Scaffold this motif. Structure first.
Motif, PDB file in Angstrom:
ATOM      1  N   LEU A 281       0.669  -1.165  -0.071  1.00 29.75           N
ATOM      2  CA  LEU A 281      -0.118   0.053  -0.037  1.00 29.75           C
ATOM      3  C   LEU A 281       0.882   1.311  -0.034  1.00 29.75           C
ATOM      4  O   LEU A 281       0.677   2.035  -0.760  1.00 29.75           O
ATOM      5  CB  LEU A 281      -1.024  -0.144   1.436  1.00 29.75           C
ATOM      6  N   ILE A 282       1.883   1.380   0.728  1.00 30.35           N
ATOM      7  CA  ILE A 282       2.630   2.504   0.800  1.00 30.35           C
ATOM      8  C   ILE A 282       3.473   2.503  -0.429  1.00 30.35           C
ATOM      9  O   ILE A 282       3.504   3.835  -0.871  1.00 30.35           O
ATOM     10  CB  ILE A 282       3.764   2.347   2.075  1.00 30.35           C
ATOM     11  N   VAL A 283       4.017   1.655  -1.190  1.00 32.57           N
ATOM     12  CA  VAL A 283       4.674   1.816  -2.468  1.00 32.57           C
ATOM     13  C   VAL A 283       3.699   2.314  -3.462  1.00 32.57           C
ATOM     14  O   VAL A 283       4.081   3.079  -4.242  1.00 32.57           O
ATOM     15  CB  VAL A 283       5.488   0.559  -2.878  1.00 32.57           C
TER      16      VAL A 283
ATOM     17  N   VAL B 174       0.740   4.073  -2.979  1.00 30.40           N
ATOM     18  CA  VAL B 174       0.433   5.466  -2.744  1.00 30.40           C
ATOM     19  C   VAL B 174       1.598   6.256  -3.117  1.00 30.40           C
ATOM     20  O   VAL B 174       1.467   7.280  -3.571  1.00 30.40           O
ATOM     21  CB  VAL B 174       0.122   5.833  -1.595  1.00 30.40           C
ATOM     22  N   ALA B 175       2.864   5.871  -3.007  1.00 27.32           N
ATOM     23  CA  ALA B 175       4.011   6.448  -3.270  1.00 27.32           C
ATOM     24  C   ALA B 175       4.165   6.841  -4.712  1.00 27.32           C
ATOM     25  O   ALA B 175       4.267   7.948  -5.353  1.00 27.32           O
ATOM     26  CB  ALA B 175       5.277   5.946  -2.945  1.00 27.32           C
ATOM     27  N   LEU B 176       3.893   5.544  -5.559  1.00 26.67           N
ATOM     28  CA  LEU B 176       3.773   5.733  -7.032  1.00 26.67           C
ATOM     29  C   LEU B 176       2.514   6.688  -7.514  1.00 26.67           C
ATOM     30  O   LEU B 176       2.818   7.363  -8.493  1.00 26.67           O
ATOM     31  CB  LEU B 176       3.708   4.147  -7.639  1.00 26.67           C
ATOM     32  N   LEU B 177       1.462   6.395  -6.873  1.00 20.12           N
ATOM     33  CA  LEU B 177       0.295   7.272  -7.290  1.00 20.12           C
ATOM     34  C   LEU B 177       0.702   8.850  -7.068  1.00 20.12           C
ATOM     35  O   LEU B 177       0.447   9.684  -8.002  1.00 20.12           O
ATOM     36  CB  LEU B 177      -0.875   7.163  -6.453  1.00 20.12           C
ATOM     37  N   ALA B 178       1.503   9.247  -5.941  1.00 17.36           N
ATOM     38  CA  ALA B 178       1.863  10.725  -5.765  1.00 17.36           C
ATOM     39  C   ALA B 178       2.664  11.038  -6.949  1.00 17.36           C
ATOM     40  O   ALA B 178       2.710  12.092  -7.322  1.00 17.36           O
ATOM     41  CB  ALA B 178       2.570  10.633  -4.426  1.00 17.36           C
ATOM     42  N   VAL B 179       3.583  10.165  -6.949  1.00 19.84           N
ATOM     43  CA  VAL B 179       4.701  10.616  -8.183  1.00 19.84           C
ATOM     44  C   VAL B 179       3.947  10.917  -9.524  1.00 19.84           C
ATOM     45  O   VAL B 179       4.323  11.835 -10.272  1.00 19.84           O
ATOM     46  CB  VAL B 179       5.802   9.378  -8.264  1.00 19.84           C
TER      47      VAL B 179
ATOM     48  N   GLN C  93       0.768  11.475 -10.054  1.00 19.63           N
ATOM     49  CA  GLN C  93      -0.183  12.678 -10.180  1.00 19.63           C
ATOM     50  C   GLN C  93       0.621  13.860 -10.369  1.00 19.63           C
ATOM     51  O   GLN C  93       0.340  15.024 -11.095  1.00 19.63           O
ATOM     52  CB  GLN C  93      -1.018  12.570  -8.605  1.00 19.63           C
TER      53      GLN C  93
ATOM     54  N   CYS D  39      -1.899   6.491 -13.656  1.00 18.03           N
ATOM     55  CA  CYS D  39      -2.466   7.095 -12.345  1.00 18.03           C
ATOM     56  C   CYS D  39      -3.459   6.439 -11.870  1.00 18.03           C
ATOM     57  O   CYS D  39      -3.816   5.974 -11.041  1.00 18.03           O
ATOM     58  CB  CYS D  39      -2.291   8.780 -12.226  1.00 18.03           C
TER      59      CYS D  39
ATOM     60  N   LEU E 154      -4.568   4.568  -8.688  1.00 18.15           N
ATOM     61  CA  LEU E 154      -5.665   4.724  -7.708  1.00 18.15           C
ATOM     62  C   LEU E 154      -6.540   3.481  -7.302  1.00 18.15           C
ATOM     63  O   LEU E 154      -6.640   3.412  -6.290  1.00 18.15           O
ATOM     64  CB  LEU E 154      -6.531   5.765  -8.257  1.00 18.15           C
TER      65      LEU E 154
ATOM     66  N   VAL F 278      -4.483   1.710  -4.826  1.00 19.00           N
ATOM     67  CA  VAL F 278      -4.420   2.055  -3.582  1.00 19.00           C
ATOM     68  C   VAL F 278      -5.881   2.200  -2.963  1.00 19.00           C
ATOM     69  O   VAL F 278      -6.015   2.250  -1.810  1.00 19.00           O
ATOM     70  CB  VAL F 278      -3.876   3.569  -3.734  1.00 19.00           C
ATOM     71  N   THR F 279      -6.881   2.040  -3.742  1.00 20.62           N
ATOM     72  CA  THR F 279      -8.376   1.689  -3.151  1.00 20.62           C
ATOM     73  C   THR F 279      -8.379  -0.084  -3.046  1.00 20.62           C
ATOM     74  O   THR F 279      -8.388  -0.090  -1.908  1.00 20.62           O
ATOM     75  CB  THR F 279      -9.303   2.366  -4.042  1.00 20.62           C
TER      76      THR F 279
END
Lengths: 191, 191
Positions: A7-9, A11-16, A18, A42, A46, A49-50
């Motif tokens: 989950l952490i990786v 969300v990190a990729l999603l932030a990158v 986005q 992205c 999402l 991460v959901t």
């Protein structure tokens, strides 16, 4: 068991992705596609991460205060998928890949023997002005490469509604004073 | 200690707001602002789901394989913040709130005694056509409510570059055949 680090990786990729997508200039065509593609990727993240997060609650057993929220997320994602399907349907209708790249509500479309011109357009107007010659066709700053002449009838396509515009007047350099530039005026048809 | 549930609820809220923002029609002005605002809120959540996650690694002590990634995320977020500052600077320059709402690269701007018209525009062109009368000024489908006459000089504003366009010809209904519609043609100035 599902480790939390995925989950952490994710969300990190999603932030990158986005953050990368939010700072791409939409000026050239290749810029338009790439940015769009990034959004697509992205979007997938999402879902990750959901969905993974939902699975974590499945391990947790505390889905009661979040089942409605996840159902809403899935409903909105289904709406987005239907929107993408509508975009593809519009692409097939006008026979061009431009509506995938641009986010315009409407598209001025007209088919020729060798090419089918598609140009973004914001909202339905009574009149439409097409500018030719720097040769290319530009509307509101959006540009399409010249390949042939323009037809007397053009069609404004949308998700559900289609409108017809007929050529009424053509303005040349002499009548306008602008060299190497020609103007075409199209008016809506009521029937 | 930092509980993991805050990260889960934050990513859930981020997914909710992203999905809601991706399915908002950009047709009316109030639709434009609200959607934009949603993105802003979503952006904040992104920071959350980044920063808190980073703090979790601080509890974990495994920042070595993610310090570069988080630095890149923060760098891109700083670039986005600078972009927002540039947007606000453009708003102050043209004295309108339209550039906040629209994502157009350029804005056709001109000031009058009572109002300052700002209209989105995609790319710099040799000529610009302004359509008046259904009264309102429409360019490429983007519409501004009529409040006064148009000046002979208009300015295309961007983040860094500004261009000037001068009126050359005005087309009336008689010369075009389109009732209650007037056209204004502006040409770029070279100096």
């Amino acid at each position: 068991s599902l480790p939390f680090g995925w989950l952490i990786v994710g969300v990190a990729l999603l932030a990158v992705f986005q953050s990368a997508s939010k700072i791409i200039t939409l000026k050239k065509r290749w810029q338009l596609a790439l940015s769009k593609g990034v959004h697509f990727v992205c979007n997938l993240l999402l879902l990750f991460v959901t969905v993974y997060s939902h699975l974590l609650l499945v391990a947790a057993g505390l889905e009661a205060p979040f089942l409605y929220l996840y159902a809403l997320v899935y409903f909105l994602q289904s709406i987005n998928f239907v929107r993408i399907i509508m975009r593809l349907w519009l692409c097939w209708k006008c026979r061009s890949k431009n509506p995938l790249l641009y986010d315009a509500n409407y598209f001025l479309c007209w088919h020729t023997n060798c090419y089918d011109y598609c140009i973004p357009y914001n909202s339905v107007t009574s009149s439409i002005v097409i500018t030719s010659g720097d040769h290319d066709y530009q509307i509101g700053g959006y540009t399409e490469k010249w390949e042939s002449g323009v037809k007397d009838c053009v069609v404004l396509h949308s998700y559900f509604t289609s409108d017809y515009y007929q050529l009424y007047s053509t303005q040349l350099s002499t009548d306008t004073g602008v060299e190497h530039v020609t103007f075409f005026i199209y008016n809506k048809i009521v029937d």
